[PDB]
């Protein structure tokens, strides 16, 4: 299996560790871990194009979108490669993450290694919010925490 | 990738931003930027295997060494891919890094994106110290700061 890892940090209390595993180069990527310091409820969760933390999360750029598509949710056909939807934080502020995705990869053209994982202030509306921003970003508000996705042992 | 970037951070005061540029895939990588808070003099500067900051710089693993060679200086044939030698900090504790290297790459087998850049406590002896540790790490000592190398624009 190829494996990756990401430590998420920001200016506030949001922090976590997200693991990635892909047994086969043409198979799905398992994504799992935990993020703490979040408000209860849904938080947008995306891979952004650049692994540039020189301005914190602000320098990561837009959603990783090598097929030049509109923003959606992970199970939509029309989505950015970087669109991993929402994580859910419980009343203790902890979001336990467990996702499988077959659009991101840990190798080849949809490789997310060296890009930035971001957790957001608000819910991602999955591109169904009915305004231009919905189809760009999903209206997920500010970037609370982020990190560069690295190769793991 | 034709560009990459890395933000260096540690437990102490060492911090900086290192840029990578490779205009041709068959070509040298330019490495440059500024690291501050270093003691005056020579500091080991390596790419380590894993982009894993889960236990600080310790979890980055050993030097990136896909050809299973011994440790050397960047001018040696016998070197780890990750062996970029030393950087020099001035009397104000600033290293204005400027390196060109043709063994590291921003694509292919020697790709360093998703791995960890590390700046060290001590001088790298470049494999010339006469002990077993010289042939593994160059006797560069502890990991003062590090960061995951990310794709930039
Ligand atoms: Cu986002
Ligand atoms: Cu090192
Ligand atoms: Zn998107
Ligand atoms: Zn080495």
Author numbering:
A (entry chain A), B (entry chain F): 1 to 153
What does the original paper state about this entry?
Cytosolic copper-zinc superoxide dismutase (SOD) catalyses the dismutation of the superoxide radical to oxygen and hydrogen peroxide via redox cycling of the copper atom, playing a vital role in the cellular defenses against oxidative stress. The enzyme is a 32 kD homodimer with each subunit forming an eight-stranded Greek key β-barrel containing a disulphide bond, a solvent exposed catalytic copper atom and a buried zinc atom that is important for structural integrity. Copper and zinc atoms are linked by a bridging histidine residue, which is detached from the copper during catalysis and reduction to Cu(I). A positively charged channel and ‘electrostatic loop’ guide superoxide and other small anionic substrates to the active site copper atom.
To obtain the carbonate adduct crystals of copper-reconstituted wild-type human SOD were soaked in potassium bicarbonate solution. In the bicarbonate-soaked structure, a carbonate ion was found to be present in each of the ten different copper sites in the asymmetric unit. The asymmetric unit of the 2.15 Å resolution structure contained five SOD dimers (labeled A–F, B–G, C–H, D–I, E–J) that showed differences in the structure and oxidation state of their active sites. In four of these dimers, one subunit contained Cu(II) while the other contained Cu(I), characterised in the latter by the absence of bound water, the discontinuous electron density indicating breakage of the Cu-His63 bond, and the elongation of the Cu-Zn distance. In the fifth dimer (C–H), in contrast to the other four, both active sites were oxidised. In subunits containing Cu(II), the carbonate anion occupied a position ∼5 Å from the metal, lying between the side chains of Arg143 and Thr137, and it is held in place by interactions with the Arg143 side chain and water molecules. The entry of carbonate into the copper site in subunits containing Cu(I) is accommodated by a conformational rearrangement of the electrostatic loop residues 132–140, resulting in an opening up of the channel entrance by ∼1 Å. The coordination geometry of the copper has changed from trigonal planar to tetrahedral, with an oxygen atom of carbonate acting as the fourth ligand, coordinating directly to the Cu atom at ∼2.0–2.6 Å, with a Cu – Ocarbonate – Ccarbonate angle between 130° and 150°. The protonated His63NE2 atom is pointed towards an oxygen atom of carbonate (the separation between them is 2.5–2.9 Å for the four reduced dimers), suggesting that His63 plays a significant role in enhancing the affinity of the trigonal planar Cu(I) for this axial ligand. The carbonate ion is further anchored to the polypeptide through two hydrogen bonds between the nitrogen atoms of the side chain of the catalytically important Arg143 and second oxygen of the oxyanion.
